[PDB]
Amino acid sequence: SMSEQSICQARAAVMVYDDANKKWVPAGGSTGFSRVHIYHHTGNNTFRVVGRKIQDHQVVINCAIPKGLKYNQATQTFHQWRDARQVYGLNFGSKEDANVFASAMMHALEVL
């Protein structure tokens, strides 16, 4: 697993969209900020997003990034993308967190 490396980290609250109730809900069950990484698995050139809550280290997101993922910068601090299972949203702690993480994601998408 040393062949999988973090290429970015940022501070964001991770939500998922509850399709049935038409509302954003905190990923993992409780609202708060996480440390969110983009990991590059160099053996098979894959990427995933993994986030853990700062206070308790709960894993709140573990989401593939496949080739062609559409990454939407909805606002300067809220970005989102789809998975068959749910839409994910990142409410970043700052604009720099958001831009840096995006530029990282755009890089990932270009090397996939």
Swiss-Prot record:
Required to transform actin polymerization into active movement for the propulsive force of Listeria monocytogenes. Homotetramer. Interacts with APBB1IP, APBB1, PFN1 and ROBO4. Isoforms, containing the polyproline-rich regions with PPLP motifs, bind the WW domain of APBB1IP. Isoforms, containing the PPSY motif, bind, in vitro, to the WW2 and WW3 domains of NEDD4 and to the WW1 domain of YAP1. Binds the SH3 domain of BAIAP2-alpha but only after the autoinhibitory region of BAIAP2-alpha has been blocked by interaction with CDC42. Interacts, via the EVH1/WH1 domain, with the Pro-rich domains from VCL, ZYX and Listeria monocytogenes actA and with TES (via LIM domains). This is Protein enabled homolog. The EVH2 domain is comprised of 3 regions. Block A is a thymosin-like domain required for G-actin binding. The KLKR motif within this block is essential for the G-actin binding and for actin polymerization. Block B is required for F-actin binding and subcellular location, and Block C for tetramerization. The gene is ENAH. Ena/VASP proteins are actin-associated proteins involved in a range of processes dependent on cytoskeleton remodeling and cell polarity such as axon guidance and lamellipodial and filopodial dynamics in migrating cells. ENAH induces the formation of F-actin rich outgrowths in fibroblasts. Acts synergistically with BAIAP2-alpha and downstream of NTN1 to promote filipodia formation. Residues 2-112 form the WH1 domain. Expressed in myoepithelia of parotid, breast, bronchial glands and sweat glands. Expressed in colon-rectum muscolaris mucosae epithelium, pancreas acinar ductal epithelium, endometrium epithelium, prostate fibromuscolar stroma and placenta vascular media. Overexpressed in a majority of breast cancer cell lines and primary breast tumor lesions. It is found in: Cytoplasm; Cytoplasm, Cytoskeleton; Cell projection, Lamellipodium; Cell projection, Filopodium. The lineage of its organism: Eukaryota, Metazoa, Chordata, Craniata, Vertebrata. Belongs to the Ena/VASP family.
